[PDB]
């Protein structure tokens, strides 16, 4: 994918946002911004330029399932890639996110290899 692709990394825990941003850097992506919940995320997204979202689920203000649903319903960003990265491992959580339009789903804790593989899976799917 284009190394100038702009990422928004969304999670209410700074430790996890820091993990993801550093992994992206290693993969060659330095155009990376952060958001602390789905409301903060939407404000950043509305400001423009984003080409990929990596998002937690459990967050205050607006959770990641609601964020994914909002993105997918909005005409301006309906096909924006959204990778869910979350501690929720139950099949019903994976179903709800998949059915809501998740581009992919990674369960915490995850390895560096897993994040790279699932990102690449999405790039290939979208021809990026
Ligand atoms: F809080 Be996230 F769903 F891991
Ligand atoms: Mn969380």
From Swiss-Prot:
Read off the PANTHER family from this record: TWO-COMPONENT RESPONSE REGULATOR, TWO-COMPONENT RESPONSE REGULATOR ARR22
Q: How is the cofactor bound?
A: Binds 1 Mg(2+) ion per subunit.
Q: Which gene encodes it?
A: cheY
Summarize the impact of residue 91 to R.
Answer: No effect on chemotaxis
Q: Name one GO molecular function term.
A: phosphorelay response regulator activity
**Which PROSITE patterns does the protein's record reference?**
RESPONSE_REGULATORY
Q: Subunit details for this protein?
A: Interacts (phosphorylated CheY) with CheZ (via C-terminus).
GO terms classed as biological process: aerotaxis; bacterial-type flagellum-dependent swimming motility; chemotaxis; internal peptidyl-lysine acetylation; phosphorelay signal transduction system; regulation of bacterial-type flagellum-dependent cell motility; regulation of chemotaxis; signal transduction
Q: Which organism is it from?
A: Escherichia coli (strain K12)
Which residue ranges does the record assign to the Response regulatory domain? 6-123
Residues at which Mg(2+) binds: 11-12, 56, 58
Locate the 4-aspartylphosphate modifications and list their residues: 56
SUPFAM superfamilies from the UniProt entry: CheY-like
> Per the record, what is the consequence of mutating residue 12 to A?
No effect on magnesium binding
Which coenzyme or cofactor does it need?
A: Mg(2+)
Question: According to its UniProt record, where is this protein mainly located?
Answer: cytoplasm
Q: Which SMART domains match?
A: REC (SM00448)
Q: Which UniProt keywords apply?
A: Acetylation, Chemotaxis, Cytoplasm, Flagellar rotation, Magnesium, Metal-binding, Phosphoprotein, Two-component regulatory system
What GO CC annotations are associated with the protein?
A: bacterial-type flagellum; bacterial-type flagellum basal body, C ring; bacterial-type flagellum rotor complex; cytoplasm; cytosol
Q: What is this protein called?
A: Chemotaxis protein CheY
Give the top-rank taxon of the lineage listed in the UniProt record for this protein: Bacteria
Effect recorded for residue 94 to D/K/M = Loss of CW flagellar rotational signaling activity
Summarizing the function annotation, the protein's role is: Involved in the transmission of sensory signals from the chemoreceptors to the flagellar motors. In its active (phosphorylated or acetylated) form, CheY exhibits enhanced binding to a switch component, FliM, at the flagellar motor which induces a change from counterclockwise to clockwise flagellar rotation. Overexpression of CheY in association with MotA and MotB improves motility of a ycgR disruption, suggesting there is an interaction (direct or indirect) between the c-di-GMP-binding flagellar brake protein and the flagellar stator.
Q: What is the lineage of its organism?
A: Bacteria, Pseudomonadati, Pseudomonadota, Gammaproteobacteria, Enterobacterales
Query: S-adenosyl-L-methionine: is it a keyword of this entry?
Result: no
Q: How is it modified after translation?
A: Phosphorylated by CheA or acetylated by acetyl-CoA synthetase, depending on which acetate metabolism pathway is available. The major acetylation site seems to be Lys-91. Dephosphorylated (inactivated) by CheZ.
Q: Which InterPro entries match?
A: CheY-like_superfamily, Sig_transdc_resp-reg_receiver, ST_Response_Regulator
